Structure formats: structure tokens, C-alpha cells
């Protein structure tokens, strides 16, 4: 893909936004605990650590259709479509603003209960293609449940880099954050934005406005640039850990709005 | 609307200042716990939950007149437009409080713990109403129908509902765990907000008259006042009064603002 | 008044330098816990709370006076002398650097004791004229010592924005700091500048340099105007709370050093 | 050798990657525990103080070869000079993980403990081995035979001895706790560090690939290849794992390299 | 001294490097506890409190002699002039340990809480002995007699008192807890300082070869040294060892210096 100059003149400009709901683990919107992950089954050793499908977080990720761009597709040039800019903000940040959800109290019977806390990952991606993932456990003894997308046939190599274990991110809630995460040694064509902070019981810490933008050029003054008319945007947004009455507990993730600013490229004919 | 360029000359240019009063559940400034939340009373259980008004924090908002600038047929129209703002959160300093009635830090030689864990701050400025997204903890949740809040929730509120949208049109009324400003609208509005959870997390605020905010987007254009009317927004939630019994209050404080505004041209729709 | 320009040749340059003693509760030099407040007295219930006059700290404040400026008051322009720039300081962090002060072991009796932390305040400010207050307490119904400045006939609405709950910081170790905070709907002629970090055992933070100056010109470029060629200096630094043996606690402040750097700036003849 | 300009023209320009396996003390592929320490063996007293080699992480280190650049009469020679790195923690979002054997949180419903305490991050990039200076917490520790630790420590040691240095030229050899960058030296090396410390504290990573740190120095000299050899070094200790005994397990992450080199003339020595 | 323009030519510019270890109350290279405090010894009363002098850090403080750059005959003189700084703490990494006897996390099957609390970071450059305010946290503390601490204390030096002054001409005499530098003096040192107090606070450290700190004033004139001499002063505890039957040690490291120094000419006296 050889890269030409921006297009220039009238409509050479285009914008979308899109939502993308949670993938905590109950994943379906008539789950009565949608954007929560169901009770952390734990497991009793090394060699016996099954977690449940809806225990675990995964990445989120939706395909934007983008408007078509070339009629004779037999010319010497092409024109896709480059991200330049995104407006993204995480939803419904104040609903954590609650002291009387059903749970643990924070001192005695009289007291309000703990607000969701704990560790949070925060991520977003934009890119013309879906975001290149590497796999690394904290447990290559890990079973985990077939019907997601995990490394094929762990080795203890897999708590470290094993260059073998690679992913795409084509999957709405698939795709686990414990077991994925951005490959650095691709994304040529996405960008990607993370950010992590442990512990069991720490304190949320999340901003909301609509005054920031992010711009996606890379080093070269180019954005992602869109295959197939086709924006790839993926999040995940753990929030932290509901703490309910018995203790069990329940990862709580939020919805991530995405306002993405496009404009047209030339490009060499493959 | 067709935004054309700023009007020059004399007079082109004001400022307004205004303050909001918090709306922490005791929202009449005869009550005794005036600026705080009644005791949070918690659910038993999913089912059943059922938080009282005056225990749910909810958004202030004030509507400000501003002078009249069109007589109306002509081609093109006047608009104010909020271009800078200066805002301070008032009375930061009553937090440094170790005597009021509450729980011992340690026994009870000691002081008692001051306002701590959870905290909100937001403002807006807008040209209108505040556009709002709802979202909840839980979809469950009996709210008093004497606020406004979700209707015929179903676990979809649980995360993104793009039917559960609402207006900031009504002072101490929108739940702040039921609403946040929702960024797929607001073009005609900036707002700004900062959350950090927790049962005990030290509160941090910063305070001075040095520091002012832009509102121009990057047209370089501020909010524009629909019929001379500036709408000004906030919730400022300071932390949790722990009381001697280990129930708990919800702590806010009030919200200066001072708004530059000057005349910009539209085309007349 | 008309401000004008910035008054150019020798002399129309002037610097000053300051401390302001903190002003905890024991405020006489020759008190046993000079910089600390006593025993902090707690409130039995909502009705009952009578804070000691020890226990409550207050801001400090320091009038200096500039090198007399118009000789002809009929002139029809005059000088004030304009606060340009301040550098400042909280001296003496680096007592709090001790762990055998008498008080509460930090594990048993065989460790070092619990420096000071908790709940800080920083303020500083450099004015014109005295800084601008306004009232806003805790509780309506606590009784504060009567020959402390407080506001008078409290009613609920003072837990939040009374507008005629307004004072002048005109007296040093009189106006307690949980009644009044820089009245930011005023204030004009002072630049103020505050810092507040809550909680009981929070660490205390703190730096100190040489090399930091903060310019006090406003978005016009004018700094406070002195008038009657007197200059505003106040402060608070509450670092924290030291806690004794028998879990009494105390305030702790720090002294705050001022260098401003003044000009001459031409006003019209009011 | 005396440093001239930069090389321009076609084929300048070159970029490397490559991966560093963390040294946490299992230290081989097929170890159960490979990207962790061993059960962390404490000390019967200061003068009794023996720690397994598996239980002490060690610096990671890779040479990267280039392309030889020299056909050796000449009066000026040609290097490669790094000039800009991208580098990533990869795997952080392993952490996020509440259902690993370990220790509970509150009671045995409740998600176990995830990795947290003392962190330590540490990348170099450089035209030969990164240079070491020796500092222990304590001079009467006994260390395994099999490492590269102090000869002869004395309690000089617990500080700056000018005499304890070492270069960083074998992978999982070094002790971290015994070893640091040397800041007396590595003019043509150029590390980036950050600790923090606690026995429970949450870690904090981020991750991007928008980010590139400069090499050059202040004279806008980047890294030197000598013998057109590339130095990589690092240290990922992203915090402790608690086992349900409670014993403690180091957990550490590979790094990522990125390094674009460019070609620099120097005189012919 | 009237201070005149920088004097231009070759060999105007000088470098000097240096360290300085930790005085932190056991301050000779042979005690076993070398780079710590002794244990540390409570006061029993207000009235009773002797800390001893092997538990009381102080600051570290070298004389660099440079080159004699004057004949003392002439109109005007050149004095060395300090224009930037690279500093850097050493041995950061020996602090990542969790196996040195002393006080477990958990039980005993667990590793033992790591050096943490109250942190004390400072460095300065000068051209003569960095001033110094006395400032303590009880008048009643008697120190001990062979340091250098403030005379005949009353109340007053709980606070500021204008004669409680001193200079850093003694290394490893002066404690931290009387001492700091006084902001109404030093117009010929450049320091900078950083604290973090509380008593299991972790700490929080970088290191890197990459970054300077630039010296010059707002008249664009560094420290000038005084007879030729260049003060170097530092304290860096980086928190409290805990030991096993609870008794606890200050924790300090080195501090390197990289002073880059011109010709400055002024005016002869
Ligand atoms: C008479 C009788 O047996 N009635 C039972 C009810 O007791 C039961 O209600 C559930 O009972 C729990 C008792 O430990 C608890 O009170 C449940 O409420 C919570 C909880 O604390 O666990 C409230 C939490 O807010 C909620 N979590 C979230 O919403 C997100 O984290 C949890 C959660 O729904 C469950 O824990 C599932 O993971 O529930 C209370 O609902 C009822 C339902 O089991 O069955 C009746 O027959
Ligand atoms: C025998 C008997 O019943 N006597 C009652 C008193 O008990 C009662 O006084 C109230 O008693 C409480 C006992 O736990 C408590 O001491 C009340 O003081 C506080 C409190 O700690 O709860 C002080 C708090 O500062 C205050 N909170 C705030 O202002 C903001 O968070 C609370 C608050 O007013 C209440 O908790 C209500 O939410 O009160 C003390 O007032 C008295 C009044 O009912 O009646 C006696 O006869
Ligand atoms: C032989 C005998 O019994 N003598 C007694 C003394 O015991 C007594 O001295 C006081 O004893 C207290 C025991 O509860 C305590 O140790 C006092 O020391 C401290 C304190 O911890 O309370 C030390 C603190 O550093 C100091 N606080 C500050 O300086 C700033 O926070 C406090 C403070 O002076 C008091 O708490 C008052 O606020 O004192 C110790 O002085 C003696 C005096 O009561 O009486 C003898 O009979
Ligand atoms: C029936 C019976 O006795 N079976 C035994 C098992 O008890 C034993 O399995 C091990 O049992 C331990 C009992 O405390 C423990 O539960 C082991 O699980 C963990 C642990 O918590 O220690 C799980 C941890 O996640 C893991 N740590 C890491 O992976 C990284 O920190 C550790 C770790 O593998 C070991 O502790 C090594 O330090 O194990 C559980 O595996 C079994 C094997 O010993 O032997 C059976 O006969
Ligand atoms: C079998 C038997 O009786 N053995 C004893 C030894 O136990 C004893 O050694 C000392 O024993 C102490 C018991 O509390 C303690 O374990 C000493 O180790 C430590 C400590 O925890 O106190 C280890 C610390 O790392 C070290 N501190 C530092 O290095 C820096 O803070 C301290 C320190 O050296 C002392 O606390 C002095 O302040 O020591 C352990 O050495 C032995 C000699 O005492 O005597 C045998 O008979
Ligand atoms: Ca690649
Ligand atoms: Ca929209
Ligand atoms: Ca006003
Ligand atoms: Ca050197
Ligand atoms: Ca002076």
C-alpha cells in the first residue's frame, strides 16, 4: 500500500459516531446483570482454574461502514478513506455516584454500601483493519471455556511472550483482556490507547468532556487508513468490582462513544 | 443555523457571574442538613430498591437572561456567544473540619473523620439546556417518581440505551447516578467533569481567581444562546459525612461562575 | 479606576519580602504548641458543638507598606505600585522528616511514632487591598467563640451559599478557615492561589525550590493595584494533624515566605 | 573517537525489533512458574540471609547485530547511531484477572488478590553493554554462587562504592536489588527508569503505540554501535503475586523495541 | 560583586562529577547499618525527648575546588559559573527486596514490607555554603550536643524565627528536622526539594541519563563560585526500614552530581 497525498476540494471530508456496549460478561441486553460480569468463580489451584464464560471481561469491538469512494477501480490511483481525529468519552460515569446499591457495607448495617472499585483497564482503537492482538496468561494452566477466542494449546512459555501467540480482534465479545492485548510489533494501521491500574480495592478515577480530541496521525502525517471502506473501533472500559452482600463479586465495565473525523487519501493502485 | 463571523465595536462583549447551590438531597435551605443528603438508606437486595429523594444527589442548573439583541426580519441575526469561563467550587476550606459530630478517626480522644470517598464535579455552559444520557447501576431500582429519572427501565440501562435521553431542564430533579451529559449531542454546550470513586478516598480541589477556561470548539465557536438564554450547569459532590451512628451523607458545595459573552452573526434560518 | 500605563526609568522598579507565622490555635509565640492548634475538642451530636478558640485555625495576614508614591494628590494622573510577580515558600517542611516525636507508635512500642498527616490546606495570596471573603460552614449550628470573626446568626442556608455571608481578612489569627474561603465573585485586585487535600490519614506532599515564580498580572496584564501603597499579604499551610499518645490531636502549621517584585503603573485621578 | 556528521542519501536509514523475556527468576520457557520468581524466601536475620537465585529477578539483555558498514583503510568510518525508540510493556491486561489461585480479597465468595506492591520498570538502548553500579540493602546477604552480584561486600556497600561496577552483558545474571544504571558513566547508552515501592500498592502501566522517546543527546548525538552491535536492556517487575499459604511470587512483563538507527561518519582512529 | 557578561572564546566551559553518600545517622562506612539510621528512639514525653544522633539524618554537603582562574590586579575578575545540573539518586533498585529480614506482609510464609513512609528528596548547587532556617517540631527536644542544631530553642522555634540561621558547612551535622534552606537568603544557590511524609507511604523514584536542569536565574546568571569553590548539598531518605521486633531505620542513597560550569566575568571589589 503505497501511500499518496490528501484529496482536497468539497465532500473530501466525512464524520461518524458510533456506542460500543460493554463485554463484561454477561453480554446479553436482557441479562439482568448486562454490563457486569456474572459471580468470579475462583479457582482452588494451579493445575484447576476453569473460569466461567461470563466471568470474563473481553474487548469490544464494532465495523463502521464508510461511504464508497472509487468508480473505475482499474486506474492508477484510489482513493480510502483516513482517519485523522476522534471525540471518544466513557459513558455513564456519575452512575457510580451510588452509595445505596445492594452489597457490602462500607462500615456497619447503619452505612452506605462500597461503590465499585478495584482494577480498571481502559483502552480504546481506531484503525482500517482489526487491531493486532498477542496473547500472554498469568496462567498457561488455565482451561479456558471453549467458546471464546484464547491460545491454542498453552505452554508455560505463554505467562511470557511466545511469538506464536497472535490474534485478530474480529470478534464483538470474544476475545478475553486477560489473555489479549495490543500487539506492538504491528497496528501499523490502527491506533491504540491503554491504560491500567491495579489492585484489589482501588479508587476509580475517570474524566468526562467534550472539549478533547485526539488526533491519529502518525510520524508521517498519516491515519489509519480504511480497507474495504471499513473503520474498526474497539474498547474495553473495566471500571472496577461490584461487591455484593455475600462477597462474591462482579466486574462493572461502561459503554464508550466514539466521534471519528475522516478524510479521503490517494493511494497506489495494488 | 448558519454560523457567520463576531461582531466588532463597542459594546460587542459582556459578562455575567452567577452561583449554584447544591441539590444533595435537602434541597430546601430551611432544612437542617441544607447542602447534604438525608442518610442513605440501601437496598435489601436486586429486587428491592428504593433510594428516597432526599438521598439521591441530583444536577443543579440556572437559566440566565441575557440582554435582548434582535428587534427580526432582518438577514442575519445576533446570538451571545460564551466564549471563557471562570469557575471555583465555594467554601473548600469547611471540609478542614476535625470537630464536627461523627466517627473518632481513632477513640474518642481523637478528631472525627472529615467528608471523604466518592467525588463529582461537573459544569456546563451552554446555549441551552444540558443534553443527558441515562444509565444505572441497576435497571431494578425503584427511583420516586417525583424525580425524573428512566422510564420503564429494563437491564439494556444497565449500559447504553439510545431511547434513555433527557434534557437538564429542572434544578435538583435528574439523579446524577441516572444521568451524565451525553457526548453524541452537546454541540451547543461544553462541559467538563472529573470523578474518583471509593468508601474513604481523600478529596482533592484546587481553588483560585487565576485560572480561566475557553469555550470556543475548534471553529473557534462558543455556545450560542437560543433566545438570549444561557444555561448554566453543575454538581460539585465533595465526598461522604460519616455520622457518629455510621450513617452517611452525601456532601456538596456551590458553584461560582463568571461567563465572558460577545455578539455573534448568524444567518437568520 | 482608570488603570493607564506602566510608568518606564529608574526606580519604578520595588521588592519586597515577608513571613507570615501560622496561626493553628496556640498563636503566642511563648505558647508551649506555638504553630499547632490544641487538643482538638469534638462535637457531642448536630445541636451541641462548641469548638475551643485553640482549636480552630485561622488565616494569617500582613499589611506592608510600599515607599509613599504622589506627592500631588491634585495631579490628574496618578501612580500605584503594581504586584508583578511572587515567589514563595513554605519553610521548615523538613521538620516534619520525624519519626521519635512523642505521640502514637506506628506499630508497637519498639517503633517510631505517626508524623504528621491528614487532612492540608494551602493557600496563599498577594492583593491590593484585604483578600475577599466569603462564609460557608460545616454546620449552622455549631457555636463558635465569640471573639473570633464568624458569621453572625447562622441558619441552615450557611452550609451552603449565603450571599450576604461576606468579610474582609482584615486580622491576623481571627477569621477560622472552615467559616471562610477566597470570595471568588470578588476579589478583583488579589490574586489568590489554594490547594486542599481531604482525609484523616492522608501523607502530606510537598516541594520546595528557589527557582518557581508565579506572575500576577491578569489577562489584561495588570497585577494588583496597591492602594493606599499598601500591600496584602495571606496564607494558610496546615500540613496535617499530629496525633498524641493518648489519641488527642492537634493541627500542625508552617510559616510561608513572600518576595514580590513591584512596578509603577499610571492611573487616572479618581 | 571523534563524532562528524550524519550520513545522508538512499539507505540510511534502518529499523530493528525485538522482544525481552522477563527474568523474574524462573527464568526458563518450560518452568511452570516462567515470568515469576519462585516462593520469595526471607531471611532468618541480618547476618543469615541466603535468597534462592529463583527468587531474585535479574535485568534482561539482547544484542542486536546490524549490518556491517565498513569495506577499514579509510579516514572516516561509518556507525549506526539510534536515534528514536517506540517501546511497550506487553501483556499488562493479564493483570486484569480476579479468578487466579491466590489469596481472597474479603472471604472465600469474594475474587482472589491481583498482582500489586513494588513495581520497577527500567528500558536502555545502547552502543554497547549498559554500565552497572553496585548498591545493596544490606552487605551481610549471602548471594548465590551463580549469579553476578558485589565480590567481597562490605558494608561500604549498603552505599556508593566506586569500586563495585559491572557491566550488563549477560541476560537474567544481574540482580536488580544489586544492581543499577551507573550515571558516572553510559555517555553512549541512554536508560529510563521509574520505581515505586510499597508492600500492596496497585500498579499503574499504560500502553500505545503513539509514543516515541528521541535518543539524541544535547549535542544531538544518538547511541553508538560498536562493532555494530545494538545494546537492549530491561526490567519489567509489574508487582507481587500472594499464593493462598501467602506465599509471594515476583511478576514481571516482556518488552517491546522498536529502534530506528541512522548512519553516522566518525574519524578513522 | 557587580557580575559582568559571560566570557566567549575556547576553554570557557568546565565539567565536574561527583557523589555524596547518605548521612543518615550511622555515617561511617564501617558500621554495619551504613546508608540507615540507628533504630529510632521515641520520645517518652513533651518534656523528655533525646533522640540519639545515630537516629537523626542529616544533609550531605561536598567543596569542589576548581580551576584558580585569576593575578588579583586587574578591573575585572572571572568567576566559574554553575550553568546546568545532572542528577541522579543511585541504587534505586536495591529497594526492590522483599527477602531482607524484617516485617512480613502477611504471615510468616509471606515476603517482609519493603523500605516505605515519609520520603525526603533535596539537591543544591552553589556557589558558596546553602543557608539554612532552624524549624522543629518541638522546643523541648534536647539534641544531641556535637550537631549542629539551633541554641538555647523556646517555643517560638516551632515556627519562624528570624534568628534561627545557619549555613551547610559540615557534612553529616546538620538534621533535616531542624534544617531547611531559608528562601530569604540563597540569591547564590540553586536548590530543589521534594517531600512526601506519612508512615508507610511507598515511594516513588526516577531514574535517567536524559534530563538536565538548567541553573541560570531570571537575569540568566548561575551560582558564581566563591573563591573557586562549588558547594554540593543533598539529603535523600527514601523511607523506613521496618524491622522484625518492630524498631525502624531511616533509609537514605547517594546522590550523583554533573555540574557543567562557564567563565563569568564581574567587576573587581
Ligand atoms: C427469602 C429468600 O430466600 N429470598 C431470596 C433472596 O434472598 C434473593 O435475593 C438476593 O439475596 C442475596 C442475599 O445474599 C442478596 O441480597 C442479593 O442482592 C444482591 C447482592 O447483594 O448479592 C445485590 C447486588 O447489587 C447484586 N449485584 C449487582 O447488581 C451487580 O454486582 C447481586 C446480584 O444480583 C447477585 O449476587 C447475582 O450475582 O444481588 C439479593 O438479590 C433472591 C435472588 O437470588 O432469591 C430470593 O428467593
Ligand atoms: C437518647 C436519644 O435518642 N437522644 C437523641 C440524640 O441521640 C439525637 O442527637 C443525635 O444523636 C446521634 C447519636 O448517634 C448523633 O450524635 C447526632 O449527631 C450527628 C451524628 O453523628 O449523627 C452529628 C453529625 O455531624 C450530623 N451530620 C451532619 O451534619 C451531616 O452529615 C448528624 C445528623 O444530623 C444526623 O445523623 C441525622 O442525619 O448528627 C446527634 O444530633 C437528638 C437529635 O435527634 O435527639 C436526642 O434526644
Ligand atoms: C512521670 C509522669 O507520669 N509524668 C506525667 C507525664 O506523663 C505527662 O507527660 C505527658 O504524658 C502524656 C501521656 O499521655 C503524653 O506522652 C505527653 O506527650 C505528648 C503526647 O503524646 O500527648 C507528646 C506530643 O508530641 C505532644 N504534642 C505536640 O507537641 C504537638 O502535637 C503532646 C502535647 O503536649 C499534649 O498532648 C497536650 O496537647 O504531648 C506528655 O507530655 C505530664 C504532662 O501531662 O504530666 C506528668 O505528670
Ligand atoms: C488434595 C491435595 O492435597 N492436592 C495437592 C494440592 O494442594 C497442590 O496444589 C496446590 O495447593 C496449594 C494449597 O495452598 C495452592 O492452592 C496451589 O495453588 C496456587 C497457590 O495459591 O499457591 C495457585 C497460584 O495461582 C500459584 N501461583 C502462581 O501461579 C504465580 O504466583 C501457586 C504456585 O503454583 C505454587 O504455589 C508454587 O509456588 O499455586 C495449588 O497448586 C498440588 C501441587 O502442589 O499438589 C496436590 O497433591
Ligand atoms: C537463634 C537465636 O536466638 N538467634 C539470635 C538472632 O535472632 C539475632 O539476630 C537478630 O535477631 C533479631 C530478632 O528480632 C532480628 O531478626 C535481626 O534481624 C534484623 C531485624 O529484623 O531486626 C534484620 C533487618 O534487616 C536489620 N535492619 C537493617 O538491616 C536495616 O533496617 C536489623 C538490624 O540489624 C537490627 O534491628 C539492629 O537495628 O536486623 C537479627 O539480626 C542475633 C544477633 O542479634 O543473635 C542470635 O542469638
Ligand atoms: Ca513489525
Ligand atoms: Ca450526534
Ligand atoms: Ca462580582
Ligand atoms: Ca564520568
Ligand atoms: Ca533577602
Redesign the pocket.
Given at each position: 500500500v503505497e501511500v499518496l497525498e490528501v484529496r482536497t476540494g468539497p465532500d473530501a471530508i466525512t464524520q461518524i459516531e458510533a456506542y460500543l456496549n460493554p463485554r463484561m460478561g454477561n453480554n446479553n441486553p436482557t441479562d439482568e446483570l448486562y454490563g457486569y460480569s456474572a459471580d468470579i468463580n475462583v479457582?482452588?489451584?494451579?493445575?484447576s482454574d476453569n473460569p466461567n464464560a461470563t466471568t470474563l471481561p473481553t474487548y469490544s469491538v464494532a465495523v463502521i461502514k464508510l461511504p464508497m469512494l472509487n468508480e473505475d477501480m482499474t486506474c492508477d490511483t484510489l482513493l480510502m478513506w483516513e482517519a485523522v481525529s476522534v471525540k471518544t468519552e466513557v459513558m455513564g460515569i456519575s452512575s457510580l455516584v451510588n452509595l445505596h446499591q445492594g452489597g457490602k457495607y462500607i462500615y456497619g448495617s447503619s452505612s452506605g454500601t462500597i461503590p465499585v472499585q478495584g482494577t480498571t483497564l481502559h483502552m480504546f482503537s481506531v484503525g482500517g483493519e482489526p487491531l493486532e492482538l498477542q496473547g500472554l496468561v498469568?496462567?498457561s494452566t488455565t482451561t479456558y471455556p471453549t467458546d471464546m477466542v484464547t491460545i491454542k494449546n498453552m505452554k508455560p512459555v505463554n505467562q511470557a511472550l511466545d511469538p506464536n501467540a497472535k490474534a485478530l480482534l474480529d470478534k464483538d465479545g470474544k476475545y478475553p483482556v486477560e489473555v489479549w492485548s495490543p500487539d506492538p510489533s504491528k497496528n501499523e494501521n490502527t491506533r491504540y490507547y491503554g491504560s491500567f491500574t491495579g489492585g484489589a480495592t482501588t479508587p476509580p478515577v475517570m474524566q468526562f468532556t467534550n472539549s478533547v480530541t485526539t488526533v491519529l496521525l502518525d510520524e508521517n502525517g498519516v491515519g489509519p487508513l480504511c480497507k474495504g471502506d471499513k473503520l474498526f473501533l474497539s474498547a474495553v472500559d473495566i471500571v472496577g468490582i461490584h461487591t455484593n452482600y455475600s462477597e462474591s463479586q462482579n466486574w462493572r465495565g461502561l459503554p464508550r462513544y466514539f466521534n471519528v473525523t475522516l478524510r479521503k487519501r490517494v493511494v497506489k493502485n495494488p
Open positions: 479457582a482452588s489451584s494451579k493445575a498469568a496462567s
